């Protein structure tokens, strides 16, 4: 994998999770990340 990550780390990343995304909606109200 190009990410240079172990299978355990990849699985941990995967488990954790037209139309506008909620992040964009929050961004469009003066709230940035």
């Amino acid at each position: 994998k190009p990410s240079k990550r172990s299978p355990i780390e990849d699985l941990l990343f995967n488990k954790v999770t037209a139309a506008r995304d909620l992040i964009c909606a929050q961004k469009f109200k003066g709230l940035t990340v």
């Binding site: 139309a19 506008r20 909606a25 929050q26 469009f28 109200k29 003066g30 940035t32």
Partner: protein, 100 residues
């Protein structure tokens, strides 16, 4: 010709106004008395025939339909954000860098 005013919606009046639409630019707009500001883009969403406006999960307007022609227009708030200045000690120099 005599005009009357009663307790009624009073929907007797001629043409309001008309103008041409420009896309991909930040601009104000007023559709059917609904005011807004943003950039207009072609919308791929398929609105139902009776539906005019559109709201996202944030309960804010994100789509609109042209009253003159049955075309769906996507509105997007114009770009904005804070600014920052990166500088060394003033005793060292005076040049600064600007980050958007």
């Amino acid at each position: 010709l005599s005009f009357e005013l009663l307790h009624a919606p009073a929907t007797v009046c001629g043409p309001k106004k008309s103008t041409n639409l420009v896309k991909n630019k930040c601009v104000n707009f007023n559709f059917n008395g609904l005011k807004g500001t943003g950039v207009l883009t072609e919308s791929n969403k398929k609105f139902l025939p009776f539906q005019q406006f559109g709201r996202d999960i944030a309960d804010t307007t994100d789509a609109v339909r042209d009253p003159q022609t049955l075309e769906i227009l996507d509105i997007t708030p114009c770009s904005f954000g804070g600014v920052s200045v990166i500088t060394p000690g003033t005793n060292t120099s005076n040049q600064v860098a600007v980050l958007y």
